[PDB]
Design a protein around this nucleic acid. Structure first.
Length: 127
DNA sequence: TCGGACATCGGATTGTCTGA
């Protein structure tokens, strides 16, 4: 409603869940420092009614949140939770990114998620 | 101004229109 990821989601089109090699996965963001570049993706799988009136489960969306923000703001980095994967630029600081926070869609459009050139993605995520 | 309806999932964590 009024709290969202700063970024569009990575859509999972295949069987493989999202995951990244250590050091990879944090979006580009000119308002972020390297110390800021740590957080998680959270999976959201929606069940919706199609135009034929039949229900269907859409491809999962994985949204990025900086550490200590968003729906799992209280989770420490590395905590095991289904549908949460952790990412950090090497050397990022293990502190909540309060000053970045989350996005209010009434005030700001999402940034289309950009990963660093050469980032590895699992099959079924489109690059 | 702003809440809400609705689309067909693209972006619904939006886009678009518009009644109130």
């Amino acid at each position: 409603n009024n709290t969202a990821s700063w970024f569009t989601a990575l859509t999972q089109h295949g069987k493989e869940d999202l995951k990244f090699p250590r050091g990879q996965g944090v979006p580009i963001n000119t308002n972020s420092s390297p110390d800021d570049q740590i957080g998680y993706y959270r999976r959201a799988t929606r069940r919706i009614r199609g135009g034929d009136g039949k229900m269907k489960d859409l491809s999962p969306r994985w949204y990025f949140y900086y550490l200590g923000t968003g729906p799992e703001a209280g989770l420490p980095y590395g905590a095991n939770k289904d549908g949460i994967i952790w990412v950090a630029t090497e050397g990022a600081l293990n502190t909540p990114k309060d000053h970045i926070g989350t996005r209010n869609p009434a005030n700001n459009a999402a940034i289309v998620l950009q990963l660093p050139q050469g980032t590895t993605l699992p099959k079924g995520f489109y690059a």
